[PDB]
Amino acid sequence: EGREDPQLLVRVRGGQLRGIRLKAPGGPVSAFLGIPFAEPPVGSRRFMPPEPKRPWSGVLDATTFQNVCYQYVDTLYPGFEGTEMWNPNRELSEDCLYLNVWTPYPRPASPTPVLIWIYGGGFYSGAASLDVYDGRFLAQVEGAVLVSMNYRVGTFGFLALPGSREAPGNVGLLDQRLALQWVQENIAAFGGDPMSVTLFGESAGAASVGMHILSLPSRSLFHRAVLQSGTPNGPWATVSAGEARRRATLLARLVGCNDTELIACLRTRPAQDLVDHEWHVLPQESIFRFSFVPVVDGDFLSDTPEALINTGDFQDLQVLVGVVKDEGSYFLVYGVPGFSKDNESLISRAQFLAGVRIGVPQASDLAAEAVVLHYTDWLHPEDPTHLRDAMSAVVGDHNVVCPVAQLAGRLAAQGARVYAYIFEHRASTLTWPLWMGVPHGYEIEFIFGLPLDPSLNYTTEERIFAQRLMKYWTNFARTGDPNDPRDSKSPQWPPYTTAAQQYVSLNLKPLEVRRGLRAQTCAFWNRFLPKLLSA
C-alpha cells in the first residue's frame, strides 16, 4: 500500500482486505467482495458443519465475487433471460463460502444499520453474486450496510443421515449462521452497527430467515426479520429426519454407495455426480418440491416449524412478510403438462386434475378432489382461462400464500410486530409471458433498486416506485416500522393483527390497506386440509 485509495483498506478478524470503489447512479460505493468466512468445506469436510476461516497474511483482494456453491444449473429454456438471471455467474466450486459487503463511500461516520441478504433457489441453487442482489443501490441511496453470503445448497448443503457425525444435516443453515457471526464480530470495521442487524431473503431465503428466528443460537445474531414469499413452515421448506435418511441413502445407492462408511463413500464422489442424481430422489412427481432441504433434526430445529411457531414466544420480534400476486405461475412450466412460456397455456379440465396431483403431491385422492372442488368455478367448470389461473393459484396458495398467512397469524397472536404486504406490480422489463402475471421472484429487482440504473430500461414511475420500496425496507431495518416518521401525507401501513388482518398493496399507486390474506381459501389449506389427513 501507499498508492491505493485509503478508503478501500479495511482490517477484519482474519486479516487485511482491499475492496473496490464502485459506480452507482448517484455516486460511488465501497464494495468488499469474496471475503472468506469459513474454511473451504472441501474434501473430508463435505457434508460437515463449517469451521471458521483461518487468518490469512497480506492484503486479501476483495474486488470480485467469489465462486458459486456447486449446484444444479437450469436448462429448461436455454438462452432465455427469464431463467438465466437466476443461474450461477461465477465458477461452480465446493470452495464457495465467501461473503460480500457494500457500504457508502466514504464509509459512514456514525454506526449504520446492517441488512443481511439470504438468497433463495429452493435450497438447491442460488448465489449472492447475481445482478438482482446488487447491494450498490441500497448502499448509495439509503446509506445502508449490506451483506450477503454464499451458503451450501443441494446435497453439499443439506444431505443428511440424522444422528450421524459425518452428515448431521442443516449445514447450509450453519454456513448462514457463521456469516451472521462474522457480521457481529467484523461489521463495525466497515461502519456497520452490529446492534442493528435485519435479515431479509426471498423464497428459500425467506424460509432461512424464519429458521434463524426459530433457532435459539441464531436469535442473538439479528434484531429484525423480513420474509419475502417464503416461510419455514409449509410443505417444501423442511423434511422429517426419516424422509432425509431415505433420500440420503437412495442418492447414495444411485452413485454406487453403517452411516460412516456410506458418507465416506459419498465423499469420494465428484461434485457433479451428486448434482446429476439430486432430482432422482423425490417420492412423487412434483413441482415446488426440492430434494435436500432443512431437516427437523431436534438440534438446529428442535421441533417442526409448525410446532415452533404455534407455541413460541415472539415478544420482542419485528417482522415484515409478504407475497407477490402470482406466486405459483412460474413453477407450472417446470413439470405440469399443458403449461409453457411460449403459449397462453390454456388447459382442459383433465390437465387441471392432473396438475393438482403434481402440485399437491402429498394429497390423497380425497384431498385432491377437495382441492379441485374448492378451486373449480362452478359457473364455468371447463373454461381454459380459469383452469389455467386456478392451477397457478393452487400452487401459489399451497406453497407460499397460505404458509405466509399462517406464519403472520401465529406470530401476531404471540406478541410479534408484523407488517404484511402483497406485491402487485409486473416489471415492464419482464420476459415471462403475460399470463404469469406478477411471478415469484420479481419484486426483488425493485427492493434492490435496479430500476435506478438508467441503463436497465425501466420506466420513470418504476424508478419512483423502487425508491418507495427501498424507503420501506430500510425504514423497517432502522426502526422496525416501514413508515416514515415525518411523512404523514402518504398513507400509513398498519401492522397485521388477528382481529383486523390488515396488509398493504405494493404497486405504482399509493398504499392501499386491505383486509384478510386470502382468508377463506387459507382456512381450507391451514385448518381443513391437515384434518383430511388425521383420517
Ligand SMILES: *[C@@H]1O[C@H](CO)[C@@H](O)[C@H](O)[C@H]1NC(C)=O
Ligand atoms: C403450449 O405448449 C405445450 C408444450 O409445447 C403444449 O403441450 C400445450 O398443449 C400448448 N398449449 C396449446 C393448446 O397451445
